[PDB]
Structure formats: C-alpha cells, structure tokens
Amino acid sequence: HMSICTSEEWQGLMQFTLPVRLCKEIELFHFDIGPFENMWPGIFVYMVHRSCGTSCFELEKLCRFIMSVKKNYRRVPYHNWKHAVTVAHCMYAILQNNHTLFTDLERKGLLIACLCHNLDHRGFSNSYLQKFDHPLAALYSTSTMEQHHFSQTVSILQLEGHNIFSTLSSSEYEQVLEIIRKAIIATDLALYFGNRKQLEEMYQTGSLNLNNQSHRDRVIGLMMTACDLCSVTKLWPVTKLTANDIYAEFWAEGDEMKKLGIQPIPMMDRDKKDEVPQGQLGFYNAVAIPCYTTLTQILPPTEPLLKACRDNLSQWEKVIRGEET
Ligand SMILES: [Mg+2]
Ligand SMILES: [Zn+2]
C-alpha cells in the first residue's frame, strides 16, 4: 500500500551535492526552501549529516527512505512534501542552536519525525474525518490523522532496505520509535493548548526539569508545534504565499462539507474570504504567539522565531487596517 522510490531516484540523491552558497543560509531560522525545489531531498540529507553525523545512517538506506517518504506525500495544496521539508528545516535550526540539550537519539528521531509527520495527508482535517465517520476516525479515536502519519512512518521503515534505525541496539530502537511517535502525535494542535499551558506553569514555577522524561516529552512536543507552524516565522511575503496554500486546502474541505449538507466554519468557506485577516489575527494571538513565547523562555536561542512571528502579526494587523501592498 506504500509507494516506493525508484533506483534512479535514491541513487540520484546519493550523488547530489548542495551548492556552497546555501550552506550558510540553511543554518538560519528564516531560511525559505521555496526557491530550491529540486534540492529539497538533498537539503534534508545535508541537515541530517550536520546534526547527526555522516555515519549516523547508512547512506543508501537514508536515501531510499527519503525518496520513498517524498513519494508518500500527496499532491495537496499545503500538507505536502514542501511542508515536510520546511518543518524538518525548522527543527534543524532549533537543534543546531540547542545541540547538546538533546541526545543523538533525539536529534535523529526528531529530524526524521518532522519529515514524516504529515505522511499521506489527504487534505482533510480531523474535524472532517470524525464528523463524517471516516474509517480512520474509527481506528484512531483521537489525534486521527497524526496516528495515521505515525503508522505510515513505521510502514516505510518496514520496506526492504528502508529501515535506517536497524543498527540501533534493541533498547535504543524502541526508544527512538517512541520519540517519533510522541513527536508526531504532538503535532495535533488539539493537544498543544494543554501542553503549552502546562509548560508555561512549569517554567514560571521553576519546576521544569529536563532530566525528567515527561518534561522532556512536553518540551519536544512544543518544539514540534513550533516547527509545524513555522510558516508564520518566515519573511512576510513567504508567510503570505503559504497562507494561500493553507486556505486552498481549507476551502476544498469546506466544499465537501456543503455537499454533505453542513455549512463549514467560516475559515473553510471560500465564500467568506473577507474574514481571513481577522481569522489569521485570531490564530496568531491564540496559537502562534503563545507557542513561540513559551518556546523562547525554555530555549532562549529560538528567540528569532518569536520575533518573526510578532512581525507577521503586525503585518496581518496592517491588512485589517487596509494598508496591504
Ligand atoms: Mg499534521
Ligand atoms: Zn504539519
């Protein structure tokens, strides 16, 4: 049921060389992979090698894994291959800036989790799947798509010559799969609200302890949210263009809801585009800003993400005031 890359595909990736100019740029939080589509797979290989080492994974297996992962992302407007690499790059930037706070197992697990976090997304939300009793909602009662994304990740690792984690001891193997499962499930925004509230209290009260596994899991969860939403931390033109894709996907879902006799939320109604600016403002104030604010308190080096988010919030406010260019 899983798609598999071709020999030419992974062999081409193995021989790929990243332009010297980008080496400096890829380290920055605001880096936009947009202009370099043919290089996305190679960019991921580069990040894995710089963060985990060139010997962390068998090159041949890593290349097969990456190209097959790409082949299992669908041609949807937003939750696609581009999104996956964008999220993985944000994680790379976070890890590079807080390197020793995480174990080697955590860094390799997290970069991989980010690349695979939206595998086989069909362009429909958990709300849709549960509202219309999709088979997936029956199998996964909560965090529906996220549980599916993890299942898809394991399915790729089970493909011949694709298990990049097989060389880990049985103990570390089980541990990394758990790191990945928890990280992917954490991308369910429904869980973000409680997680951020919990982390904020632990931070303010001074009880946050990174040698406490449950605390580490929560911090990693917030990192996943921060990476998943990073489009709001790019330069305004990039953030605005990405919003177009996000809504294109939303509107298609809303169209299906109307066909089922249900009026969609305004956000998914293509006949209510005038409400988008205020909708974005609401998302930034209720989700984005608090996320990066707490992330910055726990991991000071991530401050650039918060600054960029604040700048884009100001841009949406300008749109609401009718000052758009
Ligand atoms: Mg997702
Ligand atoms: Zn995502």
Swiss-Prot record:
The active site is at 79 (proton donor). 3',5'-cyclic GMP binds at residues 79, 280. This is cAMP and cAMP-inhibited cGMP 3',5'-cyclic phosphodiesterase 10A. 3',5'-cyclic AMP binds at residues 79, 280. Residues 6-323 form the PDEase domain. It is linked to Dyskinesia, limb and orofacial, infantile-onset: An autosomal recessive, early-onset hyperkinetic movement disorder characterized by axial hypotonia, dyskinesia of the limbs and trunk, orofacial dyskinesia, drooling, and dysarthria. The severity of the hyperkinesis is variable. Striatal degeneration, autosomal dominant 2: An autosomal dominant disorder characterized by striatal degeneration and dysfunction of basal ganglia, resulting in hyperkinesis. Abundant in the putamen and caudate nucleus regions of brain and testis, moderately expressed in the thyroid gland, pituitary gland, thalamus and cerebellum. GO terms for molecular function: 3',5'-cGMP-stimulated cyclic-nucleotide phosphodiesterase activity; 3',5'-cyclic-AMP phosphodiesterase activity; 3',5'-cyclic-GMP phosphodiesterase activity; 3',5'-cyclic-nucleotide phosphodiesterase activity; cAMP binding; cGMP binding; metal ion binding.
